[PDB]
DNA sequence: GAGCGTTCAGCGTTCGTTTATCTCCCCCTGGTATAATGGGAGCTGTCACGGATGCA
């Protein structure tokens, strides 16, 4: 349990647990530029909380493709 | 010589020794007889550089 001043007294020593900043799960769209192509490239990636991740990259060489856990 | 005075003596006399017997638990091995028949699982995002290595 946590006392009234927000510290966990474990084994006679006062600990504190600090908050932690993490990337929230969801879809994120990133735009980039390929120097060889001379044109913008767009990607999508859905990063879940627990499962394997999935990506959807468009116009790498003018076609759209999917990475199922980046297997192939 | 009397009476006792020092000091080897070798000899017993069992007590001294170290050395020989003899009784016991951890430790290792083997065996169970309905039927049972291909894993969970943890990831992921730096950055540049280069050279090997694949493939249109």
Swiss-Prot record:
Transmembrane segments: none annotated. Disulfide bonds: none annotated. It comes from the Bacteria. The RNAP catalytic core consists of 2 alpha, 1 beta, 1 beta' and 1 omega subunit. When a sigma factor is associated with the core the holoenzyme is formed, which can initiate transcription. The RNAP complex including the principal sigma factor HrdB also interacts with RNA-binding protein RbpA. Belongs to the RNA polymerase beta chain family. DNA-dependent RNA polymerase catalyzes the transcription of DNA into RNA using the four ribonucleoside triphosphates as substrates. This is DNA-directed RNA polymerase subunit beta. The gene is rpoB. The chain holds residues 147 to 218 of 1161 of the full protein.
């Amino acid at each position: 349990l946590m006392t009234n001043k927000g510290t966990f007294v474990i084994n006679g020593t006062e600990r504190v647990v600090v908050s932690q900043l993490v990337r929230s799960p969801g879809v994120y769209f990133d735009s980039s530029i390929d120097k060889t192509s001379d044109k913008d490239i767009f990607s999508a990636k859905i990063i879940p909380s627990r499962g394997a991740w999935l990506e959807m990259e468009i116009d790498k060489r003018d076609m759209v493709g999917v990475r199922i856990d980046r297997k192939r």
